[PDB]
Design a protein around this motif. Structure first.
Motif, PDB file in Angstrom:
ATOM      1  N   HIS B  43      64.751   2.109 -14.199  1.00 46.85           N
ATOM      2  CA  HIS B  43      64.167   1.148 -14.825  1.00 46.85           C
ATOM      3  C   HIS B  43      63.955   1.542 -16.269  1.00 46.85           C
ATOM      4  O   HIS B  43      64.131   0.777 -17.264  1.00 46.85           O
ATOM      5  N   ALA B  44      63.598   2.970 -16.341  1.00 44.07           N
ATOM      6  CA  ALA B  44      63.319   3.709 -17.867  1.00 44.07           C
ATOM      7  C   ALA B  44      64.622   3.082 -18.668  1.00 44.07           C
ATOM      8  O   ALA B  44      64.750   2.866 -19.729  1.00 44.07           O
ATOM      9  N   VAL B  47      65.530  -0.360 -19.831  1.00 43.01           N
ATOM     10  CA  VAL B  47      64.831  -0.774 -21.145  1.00 43.01           C
ATOM     11  C   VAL B  47      64.980   0.301 -22.623  1.00 43.01           C
ATOM     12  O   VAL B  47      64.298  -0.123 -23.405  1.00 43.01           O
ATOM     13  N   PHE B  49      65.254   3.785 -22.645  1.00 43.53           N
ATOM     14  CA  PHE B  49      64.916   5.351 -22.615  1.00 43.53           C
ATOM     15  C   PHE B  49      66.066   5.947 -22.174  1.00 43.53           C
ATOM     16  O   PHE B  49      66.323   5.976 -20.688  1.00 43.53           O
ATOM     17  N   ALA B  55      63.098  10.128 -18.490  1.00 41.14           N
ATOM     18  CA  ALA B  55      62.208   9.007 -18.541  1.00 41.14           C
ATOM     19  C   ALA B  55      61.198   8.829 -19.696  1.00 41.14           C
ATOM     20  O   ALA B  55      60.245   8.196 -19.394  1.00 41.14           O
ATOM     21  N   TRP B  67      56.349  13.591 -18.640  1.00 39.19           N
ATOM     22  CA  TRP B  67      55.420  12.774 -17.947  1.00 39.19           C
ATOM     23  C   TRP B  67      55.101  13.873 -16.399  1.00 39.19           C
ATOM     24  O   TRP B  67      55.755  14.473 -16.281  1.00 39.19           O
ATOM     25  N   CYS B  92      55.621  -0.946 -14.347  1.00 38.83           N
ATOM     26  CA  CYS B  92      54.784  -0.320 -14.778  1.00 38.83           C
ATOM     27  C   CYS B  92      53.496  -0.991 -15.497  1.00 38.83           C
ATOM     28  O   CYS B  92      53.870  -2.095 -15.800  1.00 38.83           O
ATOM     29  N   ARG B 102      52.540   3.440 -11.932  1.00 37.10           N
ATOM     30  CA  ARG B 102      53.844   2.854 -11.415  1.00 37.10           C
ATOM     31  C   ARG B 102      53.568   2.322  -9.988  1.00 37.10           C
ATOM     32  O   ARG B 102      53.234   3.196  -9.257  1.00 37.10           O
ATOM     33  N   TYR B 143      56.328   0.898 -24.730  1.00 41.18           N
ATOM     34  CA  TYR B 143      56.584   0.378 -23.378  1.00 41.18           C
ATOM     35  C   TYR B 143      55.786  -0.699 -22.869  1.00 41.18           C
ATOM     36  O   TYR B 143      56.205  -1.448 -21.944  1.00 41.18           O
ATOM     37  N   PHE B 146      57.442  -4.052 -21.974  1.00 47.70           N
ATOM     38  CA  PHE B 146      58.298  -3.966 -20.816  1.00 47.70           C
ATOM     39  C   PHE B 146      57.404  -3.996 -19.554  1.00 47.70           C
ATOM     40  O   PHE B 146      57.871  -4.038 -18.436  1.00 47.70           O
ATOM     41  N   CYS B 147      56.020  -4.278 -19.810  1.00 48.55           N
ATOM     42  CA  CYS B 147      55.160  -4.327 -18.693  1.00 48.55           C
ATOM     43  C   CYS B 147      54.401  -5.584 -18.399  1.00 48.55           C
ATOM     44  O   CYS B 147      54.224  -6.331 -19.498  1.00 48.55           O
TER      45      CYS B 147
HETATM   46  N1  FA0 Z   1      56.372   3.857 -19.263  1.00 45.30           N
HETATM   47  C1  FA0 Z   1      57.514   3.025 -18.683  1.00 45.30           C
HETATM   48  C2  FA0 Z   1      57.445   1.680 -18.745  1.00 45.30           C
HETATM   49  C3  FA0 Z   1      58.322   1.012 -18.076  1.00 45.30           C
HETATM   50  F1  FA0 Z   1      58.260  -0.351 -18.014  1.00 45.30           F
HETATM   51  C4  FA0 Z   1      59.842   1.292 -18.095  1.00 45.30           C
HETATM   52  C5  FA0 Z   1      59.917   2.867 -18.347  1.00 45.30           C
HETATM   53  C6  FA0 Z   1      58.850   3.643 -19.036  1.00 45.30           C
HETATM   54  C7  FA0 Z   1      59.131   5.089 -19.113  1.00 45.30           C
HETATM   55  O1  FA0 Z   1      58.094   5.747 -19.526  1.00 45.30           O
HETATM   56  O2  FA0 Z   1      60.275   5.468 -18.803  1.00 45.30           O
END
Ligand code: FA0
Ligand code: FA0
Ligand code: FA0
Ligand code: FA0
Lengths: 265, 268
Positions: B43-44, B47, B49, B55, B67, B92, B102, B143, B146-147
């Motif tokens: 997923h990371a 988008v 990363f 990630a 992380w 996320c 997550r 990010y 992407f949420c």
């Molecule tokens: N924090 C994130 C949120 C997302 F939707 C996808 C990737 C990450 C990430 O930190 O890699």
């Protein structure tokens, strides 16, 4: 994965996962050995096996690994696709051999190769034996008839007798124990765990600066779930070579012996 | 795998491998937790990363931040069998500026039935000093797009098990596994003990009679401190009860707590 056109070998692709890589973001040799076992198991399933034949089950016989030899030229990176081809060959009354070829799925280059020697064992008495004519006839149809060796040199580039490490060892990791994740579906210690235990005694300075190119491992006895293992290593040697020994700490009984060859990064 | 139609979640299918299953020929919970990490990582990557970090975002790499799991909660209704296909969806979401969560939903690929659900909480750690810090505004801004904006929870129901506070196990423990040590396979790409290893260490203190007659249904695990590569861990368990257990992982060298958790087991 699928059997090849002639049905005498099996191929499967794998996408290297985040938890399968080490510090350089490439697959560890234990991930490689896990993938070798997986493609081997899928090959056995594809031809009707479960690695025993009907005659083997009737006589309480199982296949057991006697030796594993792996050579890696390039470890696939995290997210790369590796294609593995596997096949098995009869060694008459001695036993059987399983070979593998690893390739870069994008360029087609050979990135690694492996070979293993398997012997028959009565599952009750734990005693090894020669392969009978009836057992041999049940799986010879799944093997290439003309020889097909991953290592033309000597069917492992270290067919030589691995000697027994003399005490005192130069380096050691003492008191290694398997956890439930180290066990297979039959509640036995997975063969790849022994590779991890051998490598635990390599000094960190070598791991940080060198890459493992060759590993030859003999399997003598199994480590049970309640056993404790000592991992011993001595340098035998840009290239660094080591002699290894795994033994039970409770009585010093040998379970494995091996050699490793490392190349400066 | 691929991002979903709205680009706010990610899905991937996995075929359960021979070495990933236990005694009943179904996936172990440690295999499940490894697949949760893998789909999270993909997923990371989907988008932007890249595989140059585990990630982590651009600002995280620049400031030497990584992380760290703070809590993991997994509920399994059916474990996929050897050779079965499991589809996992992940997303996320920030919880104001107090949490980074997550979530995952596990499904039978063929019928679409929900076979499992999971949730996790994350904080950041400086990779050099190992000092923890809450997710900063600059890291979040990278990010947030992407949420999902509206609340989206794997556990939306009131009083669900994922929010339960876990007490500290009192000595003496009923059962234990002492002297657990990580090996090089237990380490991630950043040379830290993988978050899944702690799940294995907790479960090591469950008696064999429970493992042979019951299936693990729920695990909640808090991560308080990391186990370093040269540390030794004691795994302690006491029955609180279906069978329920209270767990504690502590360093044997000084008794410092590294994790606490609970498990719920259903009879076979
Ligand atoms: N924090 C994130 C949120 C997302 F939707 C996808 C990737 C990450 C990430 O930190 O890699
Ligand atoms: N398990 C290992 C230990 C080492 F020291 C070096 C490499 C590996 C590996 O699994 O690749
Ligand atoms: N002996 C074999 C040869 C194959 F090509 C595949 C599987 C077996 C086996 O004995 O399981
Ligand atoms: N690691 C385990 C230990 C147990 F006792 C029971 C289950 C598991 C598992 O990983 O599923």
């Amino acid at each position: 994965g699928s059997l090849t056109e002639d049905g005498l070998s099996y191929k499967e692709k794998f996408v290297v996962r985040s938890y399968e890589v080490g510090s350089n973001k490439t697959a560890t040799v234990e991930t490689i050995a896990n993938l070798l076992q997986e493609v081997g198991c899928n090959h056995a399933q594809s031809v009707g096996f479960s690695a025993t034949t009907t005659t083997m089950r009737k006589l309480h016989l199982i296949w057991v690994t006697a030796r594993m030899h792996i050579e890696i030229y390039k470890y696939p990176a995290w997210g790369d696709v590796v294609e593995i081809e596997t096949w098995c060959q009869s060694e008459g009354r001695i036993g059987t051999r399983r070979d593998w070829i690893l390739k870069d799925s994008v360029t087609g280059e050979v990135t690694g190769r492996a070979t293993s020697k398997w012997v028959m064992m009565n599952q009750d008495t734990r005693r090894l034996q020669k392969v009978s004519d009836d057992v041999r006839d049940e799986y010879l149809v799944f093997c290439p008839q003309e020889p097909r060796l991953a290592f033309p040199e000597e069917n492992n580039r270290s067919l030589k007798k691995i000697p027994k490490l003399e005490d005192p060892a130069q380096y050691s990791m003492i008191g290694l124990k398997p956890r439930r994740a180290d066990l297979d579906m039959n509640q036995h210690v997975n063969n790849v765990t022994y590779i991890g235990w051998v490598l635990e005694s390599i000094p960190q300075e070598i791991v940080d600066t060198h890459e493992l190119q060759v590993i030859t491992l003999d399997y003598r006895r199994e480590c049970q779930q309640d056993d404790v293992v000592d991992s011993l290593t001595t340098t035998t040697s840009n290239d660094s070579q080591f002699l290894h020994l795994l033994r039970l700490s409770g009585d010093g009984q040998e379970i494995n012996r091996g050699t490793t060859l490392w190349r400066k990064k």
